[model samples]
Target: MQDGMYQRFLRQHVHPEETGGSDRYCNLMMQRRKMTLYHCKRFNTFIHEDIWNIRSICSTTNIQCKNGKMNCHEGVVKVTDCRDTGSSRAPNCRYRAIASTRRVVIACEGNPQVPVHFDG
Candidate 1:
């Protein structure tokens, strides 16, 4: 289970590209992606870029993470923001998809330390 969170991070946070997805797309993706199992994820990021490219940011960055214990990197990348609908509940979670190419922060860990968590 060492790589469990890393694997889940890749699965839940990484997105290769954007498709101008609608509300239903977020709902469908959140459900099928298993992010809405017992509760709705208030916010989830879908990164649009190669995994390796994002990993490079971890090696050299000076930004501090929210926890302060970890250093995070903010890089320019395309991403889709999935925000909850407020009224959404588990098993029926809904999200608002907003795609944009902007700076994003990511947390890194494990051997060779790569991006495994979207920080913002």
Candidate 2:
């Protein structure tokens, strides 16, 4: 996908309007982002920075991919990490949020260039 589309997806699916402190934050967001319909995403991260900042990650420092490939890039940004507590039912899923600055690894692609996937 193009950078703009990917960024838009992040803005729509990941970015939260409020500082998510509720135990149901992830539960609500995961469903809202359609990440739970197929299966509950055990771990997910939402960046709190602007689209410009996230897009800039395409040119950030290089990193080793999990598959042992060298086609990954990383960008450090403030994000909220969400994890399923596994104490609740599917529809009533709950999560814990951890706020921190982290280096997000992404796999880039295409001639124009853009992040195609979230590697970490």
Candidate 3:
């Protein structure tokens, strides 16, 4: 639902190694991930399994990126939005239309380093 300051860092730096381990630099990366999580929560979309795996694989607490696009990995799908279905739907909760589809940022090895596709 929002874009934050992390985009500022993305505009300035492309690689983790270039960040020089500064606290501010690290916070920018974390903020990006937090933004991603925020999107997932608001839309009721689930994250890809690789995202979970990558969390466990990496030891550092920093911004997380994937070599590929989102929802393109195995067991992933492009979920457009979350809907309230069935009798469990709350009477007071207002229903909004599904948000528009977004192109997954494209990032790959040896490429210009655009963000990879999101698991949609």
Candidate 4:
């Protein structure tokens, strides 16, 4: 599971636009990014820095994932965190976007391991 989700993670979570995060941004991006389906996602985080910066985290030392595996690593970078505001439902999901620069814990594993999922 760790090795396979890397590509999907990149497509869904790694965003290039640094919009400083806004409620409008969240509403638009969450749909355009295909995060809202049958229901609104509870929450999700997006990296705004260069993709290489996120990839470079693979070179960092690994720590055990809180749940399982020992491939978790922490990367400090810029991000926009989106949370559902609970005011709407699917096809009209509402969200609040908060932008910040902080450590994001991620699980890395593969033949040539890279970030696959963010550790909680």
- Where does candidate 4 stray beyond 4 Å? 1-4
Which candidate wins on TM-score? 4
- Output the better candidate (2/3) by TM-score: 2
Candidate 4, 1-120: lDDT as tens digits: 754598878866788766457888888878888889788988988888777888788779888888878888887888888899999899899998888888888877776777888785
Work out the TM-score per prediction: 0.87, 0.78, 0.19, 0.90
Model 3: CA > 4 A from native: 1-44, 48-71, 76-81, 84-115
Relative to the unseen true structure, what is the Cα RMSD of model 4?
A: 1.7
How high is the CA lDDT of each candidate model?
A: 0.79, 0.70, 0.29, 0.82
lDDT for 73 (candidate 4): 87
Residues 20-82 of candidate 1 have per-residue lDDT tens digits of 456777788778789999999998877778888887878875688888855678888877778
Candidates 3 and 4 compared: the better one by lDDT is 4
Q: What number of clashing residue pairs does each candidate have, in the order they appear?
A: 0, 0, 12, 0
Minimal lDDT window, size 10, model 2: 12-21
**Candidate 3 lDDT, 68-95, residue by residue in tens:** 3332222222222333232222222222
Clashing pairs for predicted structure model 1, backbone only: none
Give the candidates in order of TM-score, highest first.
4, 1, 2, 3
